[PDB]
Structures are given as structure tokens and as C-alpha cells.
Design an enzyme around this catalytic site. Structure first.
Site, mmCIF file in Angstrom:
data_model
loop_
_atom_site.group_PDB
_atom_site.id
_atom_site.type_symbol
_atom_site.label_atom_id
_atom_site.label_comp_id
_atom_site.label_asym_id
_atom_site.label_seq_id
_atom_site.Cartn_x
_atom_site.Cartn_y
_atom_site.Cartn_z
ATOM 1 N N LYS A 166 0.843 -1.195 0.000
ATOM 2 C CA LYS A 166 0.000 0.000 0.000
ATOM 3 C C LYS A 166 0.884 1.254 0.000
ATOM 4 O O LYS A 166 1.448 1.653 1.019
ATOM 5 C CB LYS A 166 -0.951 -0.032 1.202
ATOM 6 C CG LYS A 166 -2.352 0.533 0.954
ATOM 7 C CD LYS A 166 -2.597 1.845 1.692
ATOM 8 C CE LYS A 166 -1.839 3.001 1.085
ATOM 9 N NZ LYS A 166 -1.980 4.237 1.895
ATOM 10 N N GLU A 200 8.544 1.058 11.428
ATOM 11 C CA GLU A 200 9.583 2.049 11.182
ATOM 12 C C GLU A 200 8.932 3.433 11.259
ATOM 13 O O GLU A 200 8.242 3.845 10.339
ATOM 14 C CB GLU A 200 10.187 1.812 9.810
ATOM 15 C CG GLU A 200 11.105 0.597 9.713
ATOM 16 C CD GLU A 200 12.481 0.817 10.325
ATOM 17 O OE1 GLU A 200 12.819 1.959 10.700
ATOM 18 O OE2 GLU A 200 13.235 -0.168 10.450
ATOM 19 N N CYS A 213 12.965 10.928 7.757
ATOM 20 C CA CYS A 213 12.685 10.348 9.078
ATOM 21 C C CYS A 213 13.828 10.505 10.088
ATOM 22 O O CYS A 213 13.595 10.856 11.254
ATOM 23 C CB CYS A 213 12.303 8.867 8.939
ATOM 24 S SG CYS A 213 13.149 7.914 7.641
ATOM 25 N N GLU A 248 7.873 16.218 15.900
ATOM 26 C CA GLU A 248 8.482 16.001 14.591
ATOM 27 C C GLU A 248 7.901 17.029 13.613
ATOM 28 O O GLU A 248 6.809 16.836 13.092
ATOM 29 C CB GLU A 248 8.230 14.548 14.087
ATOM 30 C CG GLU A 248 8.985 14.204 12.806
ATOM 31 C CD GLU A 248 8.790 12.767 12.322
ATOM 32 O OE1 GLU A 248 9.800 12.105 11.993
ATOM 33 O OE2 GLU A 248 7.641 12.292 12.242
#
Ligand SMILES: NC(=O)c1ccc[n+]([C@@H]2O[C@H](COP(=O)([O-])OP(=O)(O)OC[C@H]3O[C@@H](n4cnc5c(N)ncnc54)[C@H](O)[C@@H]3O)[C@@H](O)[C@H]2O)c1
Ligand SMILES: COc1ccccc1-c1c[n+](-c2ccc(-c3ccccc3)cc2)c2n1CCCCN2
Ligand code: NA
Ligand code: NA
Lengths: 493, 493, 493, 493
Positions: free
Chosen positions: B185, B261, B295, B392
Site C-alpha cells: 500500500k 519504522e 525520518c 516532529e
């Protein structure tokens, strides 16, 4: 810190074969001499080829398909190794005292260092016994493929005199963990401690034949092992000179597998940004450890220009400061050298150093007039072309070298057929990372020296050896890989 | 410096299922926007649960015992992954152009970094395909014991938009090398390049239903995968908040295996003794690489107080000169953020930083007037309690922090729910060795940043993840271990 | 063969936290009942969330950078584990007697099986402590790259009642070998033996906080562990039902790493060419071991047409022959079930078997009228659609199944959400090799059953679990991989 | 079934040194003969010691610290090995034709087997190049310890003529993947295909002096390599007698590392319960494959006495129908022996078998009148004392032996100085599992023969070799292990 046994009883002085104490066939014996007094401690059996044959025959019977040793769980080989450790610890004072009597190393070293590592090497490989896995392999075609890590079989093991118990451990422990049988020939100079250990092997419960110990001379017993047609593997620790003869003998006999742990002329390298005080002390012990008779000893101390005068000056002072004396005294740091021959060999190299134009800074002569003691000796202004710079002296002699550039000191340190160990002292990351790649040695130390444990694979580049002992890597040499490949009706991932 | 393709042919806009292009059961589409212009590129199929069920059936069937993909030699899974890498190389300019079109990153990134790593990851894992061995185990009793490294089975794979091709490869390469089947996906923001890769998977010769790619929204298509009773494994790369949910869906459905992750607030730490020029440049690129949408972005910059002002001034300078512009201009260092929503979020965080008492030093607003561009922003004086220090941001904002002691900055770098990455800049051996232990992150860099390759295990401590991807360690999550234990008549070692 | 202690003193009945015996904060207690008599042995502390908090806080302090536990040599973690083994062996009669008192398993099983494996699992992982290596990785660029195998940290461990000491070993041993700290919640039904063990942990010398033991209920203490925000990992052994709640709780809390060791309905499969007598005996113990309360029990016995009547007939006779009684009697083979609930649950399934049309061949009722004894029970003519065929009964009930073809018995054996174990009995090579690939179970046995040792990785496919315990593979779950990557001045091979 | 090239262009007839074509210093050549016709093909350079010294200098320089080949990414050594495999695929028909021309094997072998394995071996090891990891080791004390898997350096590689391209690949692929440099000495009988491969090594892009190929005689060129003071390693594949010498040259020169791959007298063992049709066919092809010139040839066929006569008759039948003829005819099963000397040797052994009392059953003389062809020969009634039972015939002669018991045939199969391979044919699980343990050979096959691929470690027990080639295990001989041990300020786990 405990106190030693100054006059230990030495019940074991015979050959250990098939779990039985045994005289040589010839009934001959030979003396071992206490190096601190020059006097004969006692006599041990002088094994020769015919005694190696009886030992090999017994170890072969113990290795045969369906023997107790071959059928026992891998984990039972572990427990046996572990119990041996427990017995060594139980008798630690005795064993370390016997080591000091026969070898001459200080009892503090013998107890706190040697015996400690002996206990650990047995315990460490006790753990590997049932964890040394083969592979299952997703090969092409309609196959199930896997490898067995079988023992190689009857291993001949030949060791030197400098660390008798430790060298025995390094050999026996991984060979036994992996299910091999052993015929071991211990140094003529230091036969006693290994024999007391063989009594512990028996007490621990190892089947008869699995470990056999032969005392005797190198060219007679030892050559017999290396040359033997029913010995599957020889693992040899000793001089580079004799190494050449072992590999030859293997090619000359039955293509037995060969591991060689040989000499060295290992460089310690002090850069200008190192912690001076610490580098001086480390380089000092790097050589002077075990009276200079360590194989990986830092026997060339290379020092950067900017700091050489100061380094030299402090190194000299440390040599002069080191306590020489009776090794049973708790604060003795340097015992005698091992025997008359080694003693004169070292004094010969001291003489040679001066004849070649090296500058004698301290010692340079016998210490006292009984036993084989030699004054800690340092040489300044040594050059790469001198015999004292190229050859293994194997004694309390520290040659100092000066250098300017990094490229230079790499070339000079690697310009040798030896490659056992090396060391660098520096605060800088990149310098340390570069030296770890550049130096051509089996062990490279950073800001320390002589840190060899059960965990750390150990062996030479070039003529310092062939193969590795200790750690997981130490098991490969004692392993004969067999690949089994089976046709299956259908393969699936 | 090769030349990009602008406004190119884009045939693939549908679901890839059992190697055939198909729309969603409901016939719906959704748009994808060029972040450079702001203009719709094309529409793409909108997968939902009924499409996922279709894809899971295709994956399940290609994974059935006896199928082409199960029975195939492991080495041939290798050769297929390698053909794929050859094809990605052939069409390298088209794919790098397509990623830049759809995501907005500079063509210089897309071509030289992203696509290079993609080729390398298919290539690297191609080699692991036939080398991932199980074990033979010398267990107790009269037994032969071994392990099979079987595939886990149908693997749901959910990826984000920041590296559309790289993240797809990090997922497919290890999963296929170990012989799983995949229902992937792809992110809603960046669906196109992953569909073109699917065309190459078909050309390479992968059996039908081994790889199945789905375009769609997370809450529908993603959640159908995570909740499916016939998906054996979910591997998820995305936000920490969504990761929580993924882990809950597995527990609520069929106890599928889970690798996560997740996000980061990774610190770069610059000590007094570091190479200043190098540290400034490295920590600048640690944040602004891929427009702050990495990331493992070095999204906190901690700087020793003696060098703070110098580092600060140089850092603003380097932020002021970063080339913001059209990502097809070969020399653009910074493209646009990926969509309206990400753009506004980051603007919100810039504003928030000002209201919290952090000093704005440069940029801090939209750049230009078309697309989703932001000026490189740096803040100074930042404190750990501020929301810009904790959350973040995922965009072009570099907060600067000041520290005095070693022990203080470890506590502060580690004081976070995150632990994806960290980095130290220093020349000192001892200090580097301490930080590599002390920092709580799955990757620690020393004097570099963002060096994640096919060989390097990558993943989070704490809420930055579960498990690892890349390297040998990345194969473990894609393996179901089977132990096989067989009575034998007699065991020998 | 030694004689047990029939009325052992039970000094330990409190919480073990930070090396101190401790009442619950609430001061509440709860009874444990001897299942052979139905009478209350005594009371243990009823720990709840507030006590888990104190335990987690202590284990966290013990895990902090620079603690004694973190700084000690890996080998000292080995020695501690090894000493624990020695203490277990020392107190083997006591421990096995206490196990029989609290659990009800036969003392022969408790002494010769349970305690033996407990001693081995501690010794086995003692060996791994200093041999669990990371990697040095030849990655791209000017880098030195390696991985550390760090502990994952504070591990919550939750275990069932069926093998109290063994299940404690399986958890503690690898967690401690790899340097983690532990908060363990033992089953409410069997709290005593684990507490005596914690006294041995203290006696062995483990630092305070490294191991903490909590007695109490699952939904209170246990959920507290699974839900805790400062627990880094939960390792859970228990019902599949509760497994679902653990993985949820992890996703609901702090993304703690999860290993799950869950239920099963494991098939033994007897082909027509098997050694009849041996297969009948193995399949018999496959189920009846530990009063049917083994997780990997052969709880569906599939038998080939040609041999089913004979197999059935001999199986029935073996059930009738099995000695039921007081577990302290040396020749007792089946003790009571663990408590009232388990007891009635099993009789409920017996009733259900008959209602569903399964043919009751023997037993089917309570054994005697004191304690929780149940007659060994066998069912003929069981079909795949029956509740007794699909669900974990967890008691002395053997259902027999008939089959004709290999393809059929594969499909039927794998047609279940369980996948803990499986077994085949056959003389034929190819058949055995095929079954080892085909059966979807974490352990596949050939001509034996229940051979699970320290060496053999163990865990479920599908909903029988997530991850593996024991062997080398058992260490992965207790490991947090960190990748360190260092810029170097020049790379060389 | 692709079409061969007859009498093709053969430009490469000289030494390959530092990527340039060169004649020997002495300008000499030597001829190579087509074994099909008997006619000289062309002449080739005759390397001697001065040429070897040239090649060793080139290898040494390409291996110097800082060179292109040392500094190159391990992955790029990968990509180079893979390019090489692509090139061998491109020129596959030419190489397969050239091997058949020069060696004499059927084109159907050369094309479909040999060349396929060659491609696979470069491809397989290409993948290992960047995955051969060292270790991080949690040793005692305040130390970070790790190992580097450095290359051993300059590797002398000496190969035989029976599989000229396969044997070259078994040597070059692992050695280059681990980053060594090579001086290869190809067999005198078969020099051509190895030189053409060298042209592809150059086209692939290997740095100068990484691979250096030498044509020449063993006693001059081979012995110069084995005796050279600047060759770090010798890998030798050839005769046991020459292997003895190689091992002696290493010990007499510079203690270079030695891997030996030597001869065999490998037994195939057929039990009563085996698939007869399959066993006959397998044991027939085990011997006659590659005209009886396979090192692991099943050159003893032991057959259970109850099936002896049936197996015997069927085996003679299959020997009588083997298609002997021109190896370019696609359907020729048997080409000629390789030269005059091999042809006469095998004829001598046929005669010898008759004089010893073994019954000749078929063939037993020259086939035709041009080239070096022999009729397929089978002997029955053969005894272990016969010279044809003990010595490596290395040609189309199949001795048949008769056995009664399991224990007898293991003793007799193992009663030999050899141990390259063995095989069992049986349907029984227990019997297969026993033989895989009991037979003393580096590869044991079950119900198949000659299945040696890039994944399967291959080598000898006893005088069939030292060490292993192929698979992961084949990398160990091409590795020099360096331990790096660094003082750290504080160790944490
Ligand atoms: N795979 C294996 O290794 C293995 C081994 C032994 C037993 N088992 C399984 O264990 C089950 C039998 O033991 P059990 O009845 O005690 O199972 P269980 O699921 O009821 O309880 C197991 C443990 O978890 C606790 N628990 C209960 N509810 C909880 C909750 N909501 N949150 C946290 N902890 C909770 C219990 O107190 C106990 O300590 C069987 O299904 C059996 O197959 C599996
Ligand atoms: C502590 O034992 C276990 C715990 C969990 C799961 C299985 C076992 C187990 C059962 N078993 C048994 C128990 C009984 C039999 C048996 C079989 C036939 C006749 C009599 C006894 C076989 C294995 C073992 N083990 C583990 C240790 C290896 C040795 N055996
Ligand atoms: Na002596
Ligand atoms: Na109880």
C-alpha cells in the site's frame, strides 16, 4: 593476594596416557630445573616416538564411531570442561605455585593473571560445546542440504614454556569443546603444571584417551606427533623457525591440518598526542611482561620525535624501578629467565646490541649470581637494520625507535616477516581508525597492550602464524566440515 | 550531470494485482498534485478493503505450498531481484523524473541518491536470497536437529511518501529475497513511481500475485491490510501515531507479525574539538536534506557553548544560500514540501516557535507564490520544553541548542520518546566511543550524517520502531523459523 | 529417583523487588491450593499495578547507563547464570517437591524432567552471555560500520502455571544472558517455586533490581506490565486469547517489543509404515504428558486407515494402563489437573465430545472424589468440525482421527489458526522430508515428540505465537540492534 | 539444444599479467592437442619462475594499501564479479565450444552443466562480496573489541584440466569477492578457455594485476608460486601426490596459507531397499560423468548382496549403450580422455584389473582409431585389496563390490586414505541418517550423486584435502582475521 605453597608436593611426573600414569617405554627420565635457584626440582618421564604411538593409539580409540566421547551430548562435553574449570579454581594456589616453581614467573602473575585466564578459557569453551552450529543451505534443485561441524579427530598439540597452563588451555579447551581427542606435547622446560592438570582432567570425568600428555624433547617427541600418520591435525605454538618444520612434516606425512602460532617482533607506536604517562607504562609492560618472554610482547617501541626524549627518560626510570627477585615474593615483578640457554641467548643479544652501535641506557648484565636473572635493559637510538631490531630476543630488553611521519612508521612497523601483534597510543579518532587498518598484525591494540582473552581471536599475519585461536574463530581449526546433500520429492521455501 | 524528462508519459495509474492492471471494485479514482506547480497531474485508482481482499487472495495463492514462487530455486529469486535492478537502471532517468514530478525532491537528489540506493537495494538483497542459512544444532539426545528459514508468507507493506521508490525497495527487496509474497500500500501523496516499478516487476518475470501494489488512503486500504485475517505479517513505515494503530490492528485481528519504522527527533551533537567547517555543513544537510522530510533528519542541533556563536553564524549563512526552486533545475538544493497539508503544518510550527520564545534567525515564511515552498528556517536559543524541540516538524526548520557538559547532552538527546538516530562530531577517540554507547538510537553516526545504505541495519529505539530493516538483520522479520527434530538411531558428533 | 520432601517449609511468600521480600502495597494476599487434596497450602502477596510500578522502577534503575548490571563483563553475567544453575541443582529435591505440591505434576516428572531442563536452560544461556556477537559491515563509502547487540532493557515477562520453573527459566535465562532487567509476573495458580528461585537469584549475587518477581492476578498485575509505559519489552506465554490483549496493550501503551508464546492444537501423524508400538507410546505421551497441560501436546492424533483399528485399540489400553494418583508416589504418571476451573473445563469438553457425536472409548469422568483428578480419556471417530477437534482442551483427552492420503492429512493438520508444533511417525525418508516442509508449525518432530531443549528454537506459526524462545534464535527478541557508523580517513579491505 | 562453433578464432595464447598480454621472458611456447582428433590446436606461452615473479609483483602492487582494488567498495567487487558473469553468459557458446575443443568433454556437458555452474559461481560470490561480516565481541574489561575480515593478499591458485572453466571459477570468485589478488596457474593440458576468460576479466573492469593468469608446466610455473616468498596463500586443486609437495613448498618458503583440493576414491553404496532403476542410473553417471575424470567420481560401487546380480546386469547394459563419439555431436555422452598420457594410464589400469582376478564385463579397450577414446568398462567381483580398488583410475572404469552388512560397508568405504565424497541409496530414514554420520567424506549424497553447486562446501577428509571451497565456508581460506581491541573510558552492555 593469597600466599603460595613454597614447597609443593609434586606427585605427578609420568606420562598421562589413556587415563593412566605411565613411564616412557625406555624408562628414561629427564630433569626440570628451578630457574630461580639453578637446582633440579625433579625428574619427569622422557617420552619418545614409541610413547607418542601409544598416546595416538589411545586417542584414536577414544575418537572412534560409537565411543563414549563421540556419543555424548555436546552439552556433556560442556559440563566436563566446566567441571575442569571448577577443579582448577579449587586448586588455584597449588597450580599457580607449581607454575612459579617450574617457569619462574612471579606468583602474582601466575595467580592473578595466568590461572585466571586458564579458568576462563575452559569456562568459555565449555559454553561453545553445544552452540557450534552448522548450516542448512537453500541450494539449487530438489535437495535438502546441510553441514555438520564434525570434530577433525586426533589432534596433536605442541606448546611452549612461557605460559605452560595458559598455552595448554588455549589448545585443550576448543579441541575438547568441538569433540576432538588430544595428544599433547608440553615444553621440556615446564612439564610439571600440565601433569597436575591431567589429574584434574581424570578427576573431572573425561573418558580415557580423550586427553593424553607427553613430556619430552621437541625433535624426538613432537616431531613424532607432527610426523605421525594417524594424527589428523597438528596445532603448534612455538618459534617461527620450528613452524617451518611442522608445516613441512605435515606435507611429508599424511596432509594433517595445520595451525601455527609462531614468533613476533610486535611494534607499539606512541603518537605525540598520547597520554604520556599511560603510554610509557603500557609500552613498559608491553615488553617486560613475563620477563620479556611473551610472544606478542611489544618488542619494538616506536616513539614520535616531539616526545621521544621525555618518553625515553621515563621508560629508563621504569626499567630501573622494576622489582627483580624471588618470584614467590608478592611484589616481585620480574622473575628469572626460563633456563641457562634462554639466559645466555638474551645476554648475547645485549652484547650484540652494543656491538651494532645501539646505546645501552640501563641494565645490560646479569642480576645477582644465582639463578638466571637479568637486569631490565633499555636501548636508545635503535635502527631498523640492527639484529636486535629484526630478531626475537625474548627477554627483558626494550629497544626504542624514533619516527616523524605516519606513512613512515607504518612502513617500518610492517617491514618484517613477523605480524603477531601491534599497538598504537593516541587520543585522535581518525589516527586510531587508520592504524587499525594499516598495521599488518593479527591483533591491533589501541591505547592498551596484551589484552588477549578467551573472546579475542589470536594469531599471526605472515610468519607469526597460520590460523586463529580463541573466540568463536578458534573453533574453525578443530572442525571438519561435512556437507550432506539429500534428494527430496519436492522443495519449497 | 544527466538531463531530466519534463511532463512525460504516465501509463500506469491503476492497481497492480496478480500481474494485471485493474481499477478498484468501486471504479473510483483520486487525484495527485505536483507540489512545484500546485496543479493536478493525473488521477489514480482508489483501493479499498474489497481491492485489498483481492490482492491478499492473489498473494496467498502465489504463496501456496507447491506454487512456482515456493518451488523456485532461492538463487532464481536472486536472479529476478537482479533483473529488476538492471531494469531500474535502464529506466533510471524516467523514474528519477517521475519521483521529482510526483514528490517534489530535486532531480539531483532523485537521480544521484534515491535511484542509486534503489538499484543497490534490489542488487544487495538479490545476493542474500540464496545465503540466508538455517542451522544444524547439536542438541541433547538421539536427535538430528535443524532449522528452516522459511518465509513468513503474505506480507502487508505500508510505506510513506518522502522516499517513494527507496521505501518501496527497503520493503520489497528483503521480503522477496526470503521468498514471501507482498501486498503493498503506497502513499496517497506519491502513487506514480511505485506503479511504474510494478511494470518492471512484471517485465523481470516475477510470478503472478507475488507482488501486489495498491494505491489508496490509509484509513481504508492501509487499515484493511493491518486488520486482515489472512495477512501473516505487516511491515509499516510511517508516523508513530499510525504505528500505535498498526500494532493494535494486528492484536485485534490475527496476531500477524509487526515491524514498525516510525518517526524521529534525532539529535546531532557538536563538541568543542570538532572540525567546525565539517560539522556546520554536516548538521545543515542533516536537517535540510530532502526538504526536512527525512525520518532520521538531524532535527535537533546541540552545540557546545564555547563554539555556539561561531556555529550559529555559519549555520544561518549556509541556510541563507540553499538554492530553493524548481526541482528540475539541476542545482536546486531544495524543492517544495509535498502537499497543501504538509506545507501548512510546517508554517504552523514556524509560527509556534516564535510564540514560545525561540529566536527566528532566517527564512520563516513561504518562498515564492506557486507550489508549496518554504524558506530555510533556523531558530536559536531553543529549549527542551518547547514544542518545536519535542514534536516532529518534518520540514525545513533547524533548531539550535546549547550545552556545556557531556553528561547533560546525553540526558537531553535521550530525553524523548524517539530514538531513530543520533550523531556526534568530535576528533577525540574516547568521546566518540562513549557517545556510540550512550545515545539511545538505532543508528549512531560519528562525524557524518544520513549514511544509511543497503548494508546498514536501520530502525528505532523506543517509539521510533520495532525491529530493523536493511542489512542481514533486516531478513529476520521476513523469516518464520521452523525447528525440525528427528530421532536418529545413533548420534555421533 | 531420590525421595521427595512431603512437607517442605515454604519461607518465601512475598513479592521479590530490588532484592527485598515485600508485601503488596495493599497488604492483600491470596491463597494457593494444593490440587491433589483441594486444601489451601498458604497465602502469597497479591501484587497489583502499584507493585508492578515499584518493580519496574527498580529494574529501570538497575538498567541505567553505568549501573553494576550494565558495566559488568558479559562473562560475569555468564558466571552468575552458571552459579544459579549450581544453586538449583543443590536444592533440586526441594524445588521439585515444591513444584509437585503447588502444580500437582508427578514428582518423577518434576525432578527428572522439569528441574533437569531448568538447570540446563540456565547453564546453556550462561554460555551465550559473552558469545552474542554483533557485526562489522563492509558498507559503501569511507566508513567503519558495526552493530552492537545491546539489551532491549526492562523486560516484562508473563508466564503460565503448567511448567512454573521451566517457564521462568525460558524467560529469565536469555533475558539475563543478554543484559536486560526483568519484572516477571508468575501464574496465580503456581506462585511458590518461582519465589524460592528468586532467593537463589539473590544468593547467586545478581545486583538488586535485575530480577523482580510479582505474584498476583493476570487482569490486574500483568495487564499492568503489558500496559506499562516504562517497560521496553513484554514476553508473554499463555492462551492465544490473552495473546491478542498483550499485542493490543503494546500498541495501546509505548510500542514495547512483543514476543508471544501461545496455545496450540498440535497434530501427531502416524503413517502406515511407522513402528506401531513406538508410535502408540509416543502419541500417548504426546498428549498425556503433564496431565494434558503441555502447550505443544499432541492433542490431535491422526492415524492412517490401514492401521487405525490396531492403533486405536493399543491407545485405549495405554490410557487405561496409565497410573493416576498422589503425585509424590514415585510411579504416579498423571497427577491432578491444576485447579477447580481447569478440572471442570476439561469435564465440560468431555461432555461436549459426546454431545457432538464423538465416541467415548475410556475414562470420561472424575477419578476418585478428592482433588482434581480426571480419568485418562480417549475419543474415537473424531471429525475436524467438532469443538473438541478445534479448541485447546488442555487435559487428559486424546481424540483420534483417521485419514487415507498424504495431501489430505497435510490440509487437515494445517487447517487451524494454531501452529505451535507437529509430528510425523514413518520409516520412509522422502515422506519424512516432505512432512518437515509441509506442516505449518514452529517445531516439527520426526519419530518422536516433546523434545524441546535449551538448544531448540521454539514458537508458533500463526496464532500459536510471535517470535522464538530457546537456542541462539531465542536471543534476538532480547536484543536491541544499534548500528554505529563512523567516517574514516581512508577505507581499505 | 543450441548449436556449437567448430574450429573457431582463438586470439588468446599468451600470459595475462597486469592486464596486458605478454609472452614468457624466454619467448618459448608449448603445444595443446585436441584429444578428439589427436592434432595440435595451437601453441601457448610457457611461463616459468621469471614470469611468475612478474605476476607476483603485479598482484602485490594491486594489493598495496591504498590501491584502487583495496579502497574500492566491497559492493563494487560484487558488481565486477557480476559483470563478469554477464559476459560469460554473452559469450557462452564460444566458451563451451572452446572447452570441448581443448579438453574433449561433450558440448552438452560443456554448455548445459560446466558453463551454467561457471555463471552461477561468479554470480553467487558476487553477492558474498559485501556480506562477509566480522564480529563485535563483548570481551572482558574496558574494551571495544571487533574483527576485520581482511583479505589474505596475493593468492597463488593452481588448477587442473578436468573442468578448466569451473575450477578457475571456484578459485577466482571467492578470492576476488573477499578482495584478494590472484596469480593463477592453469593446467598445461587445457590452457585456452582460461585465457579467454581473462579477456572478459579485463572487459568487466578489474584493476590491473588483480587477476594474473599463467600458462605453463607444474614443476616450473606451479612450483615457483608454491615456493615464492611473496605469495601469501596457495590454493591448489590437483593430485594428492602434488598436494603433499605444495604443503612442503609452503613450509620451506614463507609459511603461506594452504588450501588443498585433492583426489578421491569416493564410494557409492546401494542398499537392498533402494530404488533400483534410480540407483543403477545414478551410480553409472557417478562414475562415467566427464569420462570418469571427475575428482568426486563414484569410483567404487558397493551393492548389497541380495540385489547384486540384478544391479550388475542393468549396470553393464547401461555401460554398453553410452554414446561414445565426437563431443560436438549433441547426444555424445562420452568424449575422449584428455591426452596421450591419461589414455595410456587408464588402459594400463584396465589390464591391471584383469591380471588381479577381477572379471571384465564390457568394453576394456580403445574405442575407434583417432583421438583418445576408451570403451565404457565395468568390472565385477572386485576386492578391496586390488590396486584398481585402491588407486584413483580417473577414467571410464566402474568397479563393483558386494557387501552384506551396514557395519561392513562403512568400514570398507572408509578404509582408504581418501575422503572427498560418498553416497547412499536407500528409502529408509534411519539408514540414511546413520550413513550421513558414518561415512568419512567432505560431501555425502543421499539418493543422488555429483550435486556440487556454488552453495555447497566441497572438499576432502584425510588426504583428499585441507579446507573447503564453495558456499560461505569457502570464504574462510581467503580471509586474514584481524582482531582490534581498543581501551574505552566506560563499557556498557
Ligand atoms: N507456547 C508456549 O511456550 C506455551 C507454554 C506453556 C503454556 N502455553 C499456553 O498457556 C495457556 C495455559 O496457561 P494459562 O491458563 O495460565 O493462560 P493465561 O492466558 O490465562 O495466563 C497466562 C499468564 O498471563 C496472565 N494473564 C491473564 N490475563 C491477563 C491479562 N489480561 N493481561 C496480562 N496477563 C494476563 C496470567 O495471570 C498468567 O500469569 C495455554 O493456552 C497454553 O497452551 C504456551
Ligand atoms: C520439561 O519438559 C518439557 C517442557 C515443555 C515441553 C516439553 C517438555 C518435555 C517432554 N519430554 C518428554 C517427556 C516424556 C516422554 C516419554 C515418551 C514415551 C514414553 C515415556 C516418556 C518424552 C519426552 C521431554 N521434554 C523436554 C526435555 C527433553 C526430554 N523430554
Ligand atoms: Na623448569
Ligand atoms: Na496451586
Amino acid at each position: 593476594l593469597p600466599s603460595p605453597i613454597l614447597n609443593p608436593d609434586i606427585p605427578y611426573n609420568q606420562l598421562f596416557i589413556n587415563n593412566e600414569w605411565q613411564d616412557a617405554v625406555s624408562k628414561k627420565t629427564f630433569p626440570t630445573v628451578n630457574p630461580t635457584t639453578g637446582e633440579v626440582i625433579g625428574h619427569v618421564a622422557e617420552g619418545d616416538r614409541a610413547d607418542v604411538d601409544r598416546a595416538v593409539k589411545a586417542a584414536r580409540e577414544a575418537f572412534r564411531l560409537g565411543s563414549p566421547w563421540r556419543r555424548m551430548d555436546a552439552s556433556e562435553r560442556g559440563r566436563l570442561l566446566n567441571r575442569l574449570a571448577d577443579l582448577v579454581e579449587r586448586d588455584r594456589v597449588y597450580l599457580a605455585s607449581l607454575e612459579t616453581l617450574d617457569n619462574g614467573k612471579p606468583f602474582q602473575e601466575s595467580y592473578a593473571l595466568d590461572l585466571d585466564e586458564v579458568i576462563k578459557v575452559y569456562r568459555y569453551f565449555a559454553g561453545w560445546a553445544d552452540k557450534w552450529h552448522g548450516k542448512t543451505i537453500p541450494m539449487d534443485g530438489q535437495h535438502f542440504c546441510f553441514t555438520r561441524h564434525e570434530p577433525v579427530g586426533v589432534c596433536g598439540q605442541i606448546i611452549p614454556w612461557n605460559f605452560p597452563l595458559v598455552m595448554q588451555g588455549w589448545k585443550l579447551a576448543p579441541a575438547l569443546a568441538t569433540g576432538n581427542t588430544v595428544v599433547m606435547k608440553v615444553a621440556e622446560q615446564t612439564p610439571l603444571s600440565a601433569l597436575y592438570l591431567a589429574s584434574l582432567i581424570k578427576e573431572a570425568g573425561f573418558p580415557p584417551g580423550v586427553v593424553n600428555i607427553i613430556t619430552g624433547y621437541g625433535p624426538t617427541a613432537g616431531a613424532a606427533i607432527a610426523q605421525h600418520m594417524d594424527v589428523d591435525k597438528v596445532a603448534f605454538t612455538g618459534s617461527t623457525e620450528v613452524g617451518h618444520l611442522i608445516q613441512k612434516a605435515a606435507g611429508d606425512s599424511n596432509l594433517k591440518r595445520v595451525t601455527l602460532e609462531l614468533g613476533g617482533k610486535s611494534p607499539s607506536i606512541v603518537l605525540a598526542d598520547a597520554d604520556m604517562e599511560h603510554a610509557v607504562e603500557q609500552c613498559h609492560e608491553a615488553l617486560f611482561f613475563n620477563m620479556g618472554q611473551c610472544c606478542c610482547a611489544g618488542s619494538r617501541t616506536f616513539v614520535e620525535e616531539s616526545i621521544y626524549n621525555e618518553f625515553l627518560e621515563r621508560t629508563v626510570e621504569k626499567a630501573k624501578q622494576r622489582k627483580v627477585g624471588n618470584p614467590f615474593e608478592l611484589d616481585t615483578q620480574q622473575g628469572p629467565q626460563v633456563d641457562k640457554e634462554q639466559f645466555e641467548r638474551v645476554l648475547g643479544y645485549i652484547q650484540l646490541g652494543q656491538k651494532e652501535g645501539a646505546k645501552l641506557l640501563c641494565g645490560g648484565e646479569r642480576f645477582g649470581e644465582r639463578g638466571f636473572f637479568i637486569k631490565p635493559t633499555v636501548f636508545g637510538g635503535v635502527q631498523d637494520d640492527m639484529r636486535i631490531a629484526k630478531e626475537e630476543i625474548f627477554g627483558p630488553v626494550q629497544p626504542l625507535f624514533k619516527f616523524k611521519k605516519i606513512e613512515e612508521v607504518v612502513e617500518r612497523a610492517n617491514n618484517t616477516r613477523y605480524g603477531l601483534a601491534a599497538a598504537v597510543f593516541t587520543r585522535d579518532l581518525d589516527k586510531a581508525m587508520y592504524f587499525t587498518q594499516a598495521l599488518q598484525a593479527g591483533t591491533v591494540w589501541v591505547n592498551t597492550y596484551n589484552i588477549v582473552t578467551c573472546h579475542t581471536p589470536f594469531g599471526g599475519f605472515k610468519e607469526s602464524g597460520n590460523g586463529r585461536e580463541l573466540g568463536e574463530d578458534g573453533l574453525k581449526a578443530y572442525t571438519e566440515v561435512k556437507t550432506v546433500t539429500i534428494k527430496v520429492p519436492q522443495k519449497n521455501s
